């Protein structure tokens, strides 16, 4: 699925992600934007031979079992495959222990290089929430 800037807004805001670690919604969705460009389905192959699944792009090294990543972890306790539904619950469930691990939103290269210090609210405007 390739959702609309709003409804991928509204979807995240109701899976708790607005202001989630004191990331206020905007920077989800421009995260989101640039680096699946809003598909659940965007899969990208790393040169460590990981792969990186779904709507946030979350990596087969470390967050989900794809079964091809050898000395994979899977600290989501998930197929990465789950990361490539129309429902987005298992990415921003993931996403939320991703975010806590301590470098926050900057664990997304897309996020650092695109989002970080720009206005992130103009992702999120004109939205019914």
């Known amino acids: 699925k390739v959702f609309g800037r709003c409804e991928l807004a509204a979807a995240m805001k109701r899976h708790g992600l607005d ?32 792969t990186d699944y779904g709507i946030l792009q979350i990596n087969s090294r470390w ?7 050898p000395g994979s972890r899977n600290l989501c306790n998930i197929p990465c495959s789950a990361l490539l539904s129309s429902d987005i619950t ?8 991703i975010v806590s691990d301590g470098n926050g939103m900057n664990a997304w290269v897309a996020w650092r290089n695109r989002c970080k210090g ?5 992702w999120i405007r004109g939205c019914r929430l």
Do not use: I, P
């Open 19 to 50: 202001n989630y670690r004191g990331y206020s919604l905007g920077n989800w969705v421009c995260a989101a934007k640039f680096e699946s460009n809003f598909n659940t389905q965007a899969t990208n192959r790393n040169t460590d031979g990981s």
């Open 63 to 69: 967050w989900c079992n794809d079964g091809r990543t």
């Open 118 to 122: 720009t206005d992130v609210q103009a």
């Open 90 to 97: 298992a990415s921003v469930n993931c996403a939320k222990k």
